[PDB]
Amino acid sequence: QITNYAKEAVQSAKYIGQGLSVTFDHMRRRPITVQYPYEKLIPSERFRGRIHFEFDKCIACEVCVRVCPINLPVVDWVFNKELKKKELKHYSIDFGVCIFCANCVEYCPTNCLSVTEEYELATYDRHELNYDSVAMGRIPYKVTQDPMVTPIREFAYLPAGVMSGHDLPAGAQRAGERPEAIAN
Amino acid sequence: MLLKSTTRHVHIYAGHVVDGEVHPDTETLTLNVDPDNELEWNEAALAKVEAKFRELVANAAGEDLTEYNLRRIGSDLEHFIRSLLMQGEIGYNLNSRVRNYSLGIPRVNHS
Amino acid sequence: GVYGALAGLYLLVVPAIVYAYLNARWYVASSFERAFMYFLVTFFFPGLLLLAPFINFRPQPRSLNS
Amino acid sequence: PAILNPIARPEVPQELAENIILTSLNDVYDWARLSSLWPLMYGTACCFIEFAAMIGSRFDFDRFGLVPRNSPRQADLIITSGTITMKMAPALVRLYEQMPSPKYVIAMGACTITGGMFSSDSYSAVRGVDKLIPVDVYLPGCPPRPEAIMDAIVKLRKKIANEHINERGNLAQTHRLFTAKHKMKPVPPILTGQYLNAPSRQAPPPALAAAM
Amino acid sequence: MTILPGMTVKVTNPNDTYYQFQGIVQRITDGKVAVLFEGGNWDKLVTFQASELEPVV
Amino acid sequence: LWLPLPMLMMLIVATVGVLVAVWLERKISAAVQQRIGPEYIGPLGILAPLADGLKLIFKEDVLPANSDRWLFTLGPAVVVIPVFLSYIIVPFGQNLLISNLAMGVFLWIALSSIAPIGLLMAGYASNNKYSLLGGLRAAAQSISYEIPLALAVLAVAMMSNGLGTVEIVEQQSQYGILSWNVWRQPIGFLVFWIAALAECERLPFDLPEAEEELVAGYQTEYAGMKFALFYLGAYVNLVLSALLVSVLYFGGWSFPIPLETIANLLGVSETNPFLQIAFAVLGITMTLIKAYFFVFLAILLRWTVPRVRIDQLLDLGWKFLLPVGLVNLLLTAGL
Amino acid sequence: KIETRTEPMVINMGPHHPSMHGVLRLMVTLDGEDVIDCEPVIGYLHRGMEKIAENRTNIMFIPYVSRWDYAAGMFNEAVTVNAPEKLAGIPVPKRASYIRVIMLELNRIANHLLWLGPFLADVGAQTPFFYIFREREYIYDLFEAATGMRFINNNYFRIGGVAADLTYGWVTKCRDFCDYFLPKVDEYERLITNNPIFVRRLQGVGKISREEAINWGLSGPMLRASGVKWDLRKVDHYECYDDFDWDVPVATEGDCLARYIVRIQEMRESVKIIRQALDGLPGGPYENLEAKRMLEGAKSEWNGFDYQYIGKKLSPTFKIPKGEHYVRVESGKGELGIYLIGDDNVFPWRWKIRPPDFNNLQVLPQLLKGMKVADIVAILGSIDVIMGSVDR
Amino acid sequence: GLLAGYQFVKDLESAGALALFVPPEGGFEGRYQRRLRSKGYTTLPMSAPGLGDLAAYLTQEHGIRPAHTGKEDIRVYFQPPLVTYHLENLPPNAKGLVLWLIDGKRLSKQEFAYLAQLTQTLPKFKVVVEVGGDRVVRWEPLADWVAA
């Protein structure tokens, strides 16, 4: 009646008041966001960006092909029966077909293939992703050595205690390789 | 229902086009080759596929009206449109705003 | 409407001060300064829309001391 | 012949002349399109979580200007996010045909470029979405990082600023229509909209429930 | 000290995430040197700025 | 061609009033999710309302296949003309009024009644099944929140002895902040504010179809310049409804003596050239300090409440906001 | 043009589907407000996964498998490497056994954090969607440290154990996260359990009893919210989950409110298994294990067959032996299983994935029997559905 | 600044090999391949990491090996050399073409000078190798950049 609609409404007229001051207190916090072209995020030590190649190390034995998920890396090789060894002449991994699973870099004894860190490889034509053996053998792009990036670190690379990579003036990873070599 | 087969170079519909709004029929098949203009055509090869379009509709005129059969025709036109390019009859467009060369790259014959 | 005396006080000279104020204390300003910061933009907006493509807030290039 | 898949020579001269003002009013056209292109909220396979992570907090989507709109009429950009099979192939070209005319598809992931791990032997995956729609910017990676999808938008903003205002006649589709009459026998549809109240679920059939 | 393709170097500087890892150098360039780290399973090579790398005998 | 000076100066502050409310939507709603917002365009996002609307012009505003042609185009032109005509009411400033109509808070509720036809001739004409289901639902939502909003203005017209919107805000100019109508009508203001928020804001609207009762609402098959009238014509009503809150209840152009310390949302010194222009334009526009607090509130209230469904949206307007709208009118009378 | 008839209106939910669980197509039909029939048209994302597996070796297939349950990731690599390691009798080192448990429990936390985002948006509150992906990027960067990718495509599980051991500052970096996140599981529980509007959207909405939820074939937090208490980690004594104490969360009500509180208490129970596995890891952290391999480098208690990350690094030409199999893993959506039968060559003869989200989906037409239109997505979201596991 | 004239057109015909330092978000690079293209110069935007040894790709015919994926043989697609093939198509009623390389900061220093000493030895042909990042787009010849 006239004695209910000003008391059956305060049950939710004050729930928004304890919902407004909660959401309004999210604006006081620092905006956790990683602006890409100006603050690139440093990848991990095991991140699999794209493949690096050394031309004078792969003696044409195609274990890069036999453990590939889709038999991708194109090994163009002759038998070369004059010098009693097989030597290749081309090595092309079609990116775009290339998932970055890195089975070639695991099953190799001679340590030829290797993963870089770059990922910003986004062209205008798919046939420009057929990286040649001298086009995979170029230098990586390191996100620290660029005079526009302010390269912030990742989680599990901050020091122990902090869960943000923005306002970090110094520090390192939260463990040491050899503290316990001269101690124990 | 408007059963159809929409690939990039081939848009086979089941029905005749009456000024943009397609009406689904039971007898006819509309085909427009290259709605996006990726291949620059000419006078002859726009009439060469009619020797393959009207062949494939007539030769396969004993099967059902499913979109599996409208696709099975369109997968043979787009394998005839490619055989025009590997014979060098038509060529890619260069006024086109995209340049991905979806039917293979330009390459010379025997090195 | 004043022809050129009071209009330039609203359109040009005071919004050029806010753009210096917007660059300096925007991310490091407190919980009280940020709410006042949104009021000057919602008031000098026909002033700040004029000198919009002349000032770029892109960060300064680093020196690479390492 | 001489060259397999030859390139047709431009016989049109492309007299694209203007003064300073009409290329100043072309800078306003090209800036206002690259700076606020709205993506269609499209996602099929695993490379939607990589793109849904970019909508969120750690990487801001709407920082370059990209407000995602979930209908093809309002949106213009479409990020081909995940594997397209033989089904979802005509449901995507229908999603591409119903957009206003400066569209700019980008591809995304290894499966819309070549059909990444489904190129060797899959009986229903369209190997690459350039078999269906014209792609502006490719993007390999499996999945691409959410820092790398904002790289392909950076490459796409370099493609909008190249676009000329008076070359808008190629932004409309052409009509090379033909018409042939078939002799195929029409069939009734398979998937009508009844699952529960179909008269095949309520009771077991005779000559089989005896030994049941 | 000049670093030839085949020496065993390690990073020294503390303001970098690749902080004390050692690995074999590969593919020196005009101003940069790449070091194949071989960290655990997948050997990842990261460039460096032709300095800050104390070699190991 | 608009030889009236007051009529052009109002059409600009009804045009820059949209771009404030679009930019404020993309920065307040990006503050409450801890992200930047649109950077990289303008300084910090100032050209995001310009560039979002300028790209809507340059797109092919194409029709669907089998649609009505004269009602598709006239669809958005009935939603946005009465919310643009009803800016002729709001008298921001002591020395500014465009037209002193002898009514006008009744002409505003009259003109805001034509907008359910604009959602009907757009939901019908776009001609798919999910825009009749969305058009008949969007039309049946401005219906229910219109009688509560017209009774909030009945109470504040009883106290004001008129409908002239200068004579309303002149009754609150005798005591500065003691005689604002919010202090005397604290239950008819929430009836105004909940109903006005339920006719133009983005929390009780079926346009984001994450609930999938329809496809994407009634503006699904719209594109281009027609879609810009449904999009940059929704914030025209968010500003006008927020203006009329700060005209009816909160006193338009009313405030005490400004001679205070530096804590008055201004600079540092007392008599600078910077406070004389923060006073004189405030001696021209005092209401759009208040009117951009409820636009700040309506954006912030979008993320505060959950998305109430349409089954409980019309169980709020008819069953709650209208009986409270009645007993407020009797309590504003004697009884 | 559209006409207004008195027949039941059938609407097409569309394979566009602007949501974060893939591509269905529901031809649901309406009778004013209550739906009366609903057929799911699935198979839009059938990329031919059982036909691929007949022409792959095992180590060529582990990159393929984290795409079925692509919300989780390495829940699918666990089943694939457990097809011949449980058949050829390859012994797993116990440090790798406790390393897998840390990854599988970190996936289940990241599994329920992808379900919770779109689900809370479907039933109401839209702003906690962005504060939940912020909690998901902490689990991504932990997987990014040990494995080289964020959430899928991490060839980390092997037939002989795990691929490689962890990084250095890792165990102290869960202890930051997995002791910060646990105050927030109790935060998401108070959104739906309090605020009596969301319980007016979930009480009795999509109910199923116990006996029909076992008959229809259901597993995971659709089965356990039907009062069944069947969890495959306790049932099948699987990979050192029996060395910990933990509970199986049951809520015997059946409604969609019962599936919220199971999937919240499986986040909280997964943090308890993490804290006991980090403290029970047999060599401790890796920055302390490699030191003890340096100070006593000849032969110690360390460098055993346990305290290492793999038993024997297997050849790429590893033949799956002859004999059938069915390997069960309680995934984040239900029970995930493969049916391997192999000849003695390097390829299997048949690889029948039993998806945990396939057999939870067939009750969705039965659950949508008399339910309104406004709670169609609250039923569809509450199955923890992922299209890609359904369609394979 | 804001209103750009046509100084970028005359700077490319003068130097022959430019080097653009654009903001790293893109969008303002391409307003200078429009004034370049309004003055008759066609533009072929390639990719800089995708190009192999530029002797074998720009002026020589190169064997692009396709992805055989285990279900083919090792094919070799001998593409024609790009600069001489895209110049023979263009009639002499227009000017030459440019090579607007993007992501040019990952070319080696030897391959910068080879793109510098080739644009003079080839008539009516230029390169605009977009390299580096800056707050404002500004250009300089490649002759000064390789000596920097």
Ligand code: SF4
């Ligand atoms: S895997 Fe290594 S050894 Fe084998 S072919 Fe490739 S590069 Fe050579």
Ligand code: SF4
């Ligand atoms: S990156 Fe992966 S898919 Fe590509 S060649 Fe190497 S192992 Fe094969």
Ligand code: SF4
């Ligand atoms: S390539 Fe892999 S990650 Fe990318 S969309 Fe396909 S399945 Fe998903």
